[PDB]
């Protein structure tokens, strides 16, 4: 029914790393992630995708949320497991696929991100954990959604 995905926010006390995809989600800033592979844990997939997409090596990951995405007329629900970290090693690498950039917390480019980010980023920035569901029509319109803070992701 649903397909496992990861999403990793490198969130430091004064800045967050985002990445701009050159070609799904192209032209938007987003966290780093993708599909989880066979025999791979969700956390291991999060570590892998962060390195593949940003060049960074993450030490400890922390689960901060789970977000299910529905795109009307698409059979697969995206079950996105959201992680946060402050302990990274390396420098963000720009590749032909991905352009990383640090943003000050007051300057997060919400107009150039997936529209769901405006809803749950304020929770992530105050260190709250959450479960969410977003129903999209196309890539730009949220038809409906639910979002609640949780003690256990």
What is the span of the domain harbouring residue 107? 1-153
Entry resolution (Å): 2.0
Can you read off the two tokens belonging to residue 36? 């989880």
- CB count in 10 Å sphere of residue 144: 9
Domain tally, the chain: 1
Experimental method: X-ray
d(Cα 100, Cα 151) in Å, to the nearest integer? Answer: 31
- CB count in 10 Å sphere of residue 111: 9
* CATH code, domain carrying 40: 3.90.79.10
Q: With 0-12 CB in 10 A as exposed, 13-18 as middle and 19+ as buried, what is 152?
A: exposed
């Amino acid at each position: 029914a649903s397909r496992l995905y990861t999403l990793v926010l490198v969130l430091q006390p004064q800045r967050v790393l985002l990445g701009m995809k050159k070609r799904a989600g192209a032209g938007r800033w987003n966290g780093f992630g993708g599909k989880v592979q066979e025999g791979e844990t969700i956390e291991d997939g999060a570590r892998r995708e962060l390195q593949e997409e940003s060049g960074l090596t993450v030490d400890a990951l922390h689960k901060v949320g789970q977000i299910v995405f529905e795109f009307v007329g698409e059979p697969e629900l995206m079950d996105v497991h959201v992680f946060c970290t402050d302990s990274i090693q390396g420098t963000p690498v720009e590749s032909d696929e991905m352009r990383p950039c640090w943003f000050q917390l007051d300057q997060i480019p919400f107009k150039d991100m997936w529209p769901d980010d405006s809803y749950w980023f304020p929770l992530l920035l105050q260190k709250k954990k959450f479960h969410g569901y977003f129903k999209f029509q196309g890539q730009d319109t949220i038809l409906d959604y639910t979002l609640r803070e949780v003690d256990t992701v």
